[PDB]
Amino acid sequence: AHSAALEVLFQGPGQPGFCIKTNSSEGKVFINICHSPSIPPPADVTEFRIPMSLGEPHAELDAKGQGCTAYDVAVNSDFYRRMQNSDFLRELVITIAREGLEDKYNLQLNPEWRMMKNRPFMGSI
């Protein structure tokens, strides 16, 4: 009961930012936080709902040649810059994105996620 994701339409491809590693009961799940100018930033508040696209799952191979699931979640480019300079803002958006994907596709993702520091994106582009 904190903040929430708001799904907007988007194609796609946008541009990668960073990659989050988590899992379901079945296997590994990767959340690719991407960004695009064509996606609205959060509305200026008078007194947080984050607009973001929730991409369809696409299977990719992990480092061991095993299939895993990856989701592309795109956010506003300017809002993304603000995310890069804010650990609080970034981690919140992660949680928000994860719960957005859980809602849309009926998944149970691991809250205890891990940040990929070398890999910016799981898949192609």
């Binding site: 990668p16 590693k21 590994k28 990767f30 992990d62 480092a63 061991k64 891990r114 990929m116 520091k117 070398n118 890999r119 910016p120 994106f121 799981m122 898949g123 192609s124 582009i125």
Partner: peptide, 11 residues
């Protein structure tokens, strides 16, 4: 210590 999948791949 790295994650098993934490390696740079030029998308």
């Amino acid at each position: 210590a790295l994650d098993s999948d934490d390696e740079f791949v030029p998308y």
